[model samples]
Target: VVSIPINNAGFEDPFIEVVDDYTVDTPPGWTTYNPNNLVPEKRTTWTSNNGVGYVGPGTQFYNQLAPEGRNIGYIYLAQKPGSGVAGFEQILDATLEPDTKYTLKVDVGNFGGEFQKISLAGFPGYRVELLAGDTVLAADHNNLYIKDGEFKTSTVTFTATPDNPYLDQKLGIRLINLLQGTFSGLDFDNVRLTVEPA
Candidate 1:
């Protein structure tokens, strides 16, 4: 649950955009292409070349019939799928002030993974800092390893500090998973970004 201030007040619902499509949604600003190759239980959206494999709540997200490397697994947050090369993504497009302070928050639900870092940058680009903002409110590189079916909400903040510029710019939130076999799926909700008063 990340957030930022707005005119010195806390503004909720900070997620710049939402893709609640239970079936499959194109990742923000991502291009996909299908080589005419199809997988069972998959559908082609009008967005990209990468076909989306639809897996409902009562069904498994992966299709065992698909060959290795073509197994489009269930990927949350964005149009990311795992069981192929082990990667996931999340995207955002917000109109924020360049010098104004902000906070980003997220709720984590029973996740296990390494190299899971949060970043705020442009499309296909992010600052090389461990954490983006200069205020450095909070950053937990590792999530608490929890049991299956368990859930936990981990809230964090990225204050828009003066040292770290770019307020009136589109933001990109990316979580990198470096550990293998460790479940990296994190259920995020109630994201917020508020602006601080002048």
Candidate 2:
């Protein structure tokens, strides 16, 4: 079994411009970060979508809808607390296949209502890593519980490390939002990667 070619992974295409309310860029194959380099007024604004408008007060939490296509990718925590957090990265033209057995599916949630009024025992609601450039071949953190508008799929599986120093390299997947300081907001979509033959 084999199926790996994740570019844009379901983020649709490059189209970000929310301006006044906030909006940043990088989503056409993706590679964005804001590690405290916060400046879009304190950062935490990654947005791209198929869900319209998105005004205030949960905006119906960005209005769910997109779990796979028709566009979907968001952040918007309106950073200030600690500059929140934001992330995106993708680079998989298929590479790791040593002991083959890879599986990475995604579809996290949280669409507002102020993320269930904050403090869900310290929220962890986001993370999916399977890199190769900076190493770190696998990671997961669905920690589920933000079922507001519903959107949950998170999964991760890895197996390919037999003298595999990145196995000729090229396999990256990130979608972080460590919920720093929390204003709460996130949503991604249908990113699938598969392999078998173990």
Candidate 3:
């Protein structure tokens, strides 16, 4: 098996800042973006150690804590259909070998509603994808929708192919929320990647 180093796998340390509506800070070795292309003021809230700022559960959603630490990353949904899609990306420390099998594991869950309705809208779930540049190596989604403070781990497996020109280049990983409707968001932690010969 090949060892790959993924910085900030749990998103623990970051340049944190407090602001109105939501906090915006970039963790080292990671890049974040909003597909909705909204400004910071209008962008959907993505928090570390906090859940959706004051809009939703806030710190309550992370009361369970992360799988490995006291902090976890959270991405808030847009509620509306065409907006509120945001996530983080990281460039792997190693290049992917063609035709090699790899597995990506991450913990994901709905932040504020599990068995019962915590709010007017229920949980909409989220998804995680392993990518080599813009090409998706593999993808997985969570539709079970857990309670406010619960989370479950998911795994995605894919083999790098020579068809992808970037196979020999540094790989990337991205996580984004899949809009189901209003009241959609998720918490993530314990991200890990491993590879072996096919």
User: In lDDT terms, which candidate is top?
Assistant: 3
lDDT string for model 2 (1-198, tens) is: 667888777775644344213235455677665565432433332421112222333234445455654556665444444445566777776666587888888887665444335532233358788887768788886566655556678888888867777786878888877655344456677788888878
Q: RMSD for each model, in Å, please?
A: 12.8, 14.6, 5.4
Clashing pairs in 2: 58-61, 61-111
Global lDDT of each model? 0.31, 0.61, 0.62
CA error at residue 40 for candidate 2, angstroms: 14
Pick the winner on lDDT between candidates 1 and 2.
2
* Total backbone clashes of candidate 3, pairs 3 or more residues apart or in separate chains: 4
By summed lDDT, which 10 consecutive residues of candidate 2 come out lowest? 47-56
Mind giving the per-residue lDDT tens digits that candidate 3 earns over 92-111?
A: 86776887899888887565
Candidate 1: segments with Cα more than 4 A from true spot:
1-99, 111-139, 165-167, 176-180, 183-186
TM-score of each: 0.40, 0.30, 0.74
**Model 1 per-residue lDDT tens digits across residues 15-41:** 222222233433333222122222223
Off by over 4 Å in 2: 1-36, 39-76, 80-99, 114-129, 135-148, 154-165, 168-173, 177-184, 187-198
Clashes of 2: 2
Cα error of candidate 1 at position 15, Å: 19
So what's the TM-score on candidate 2? 0.30
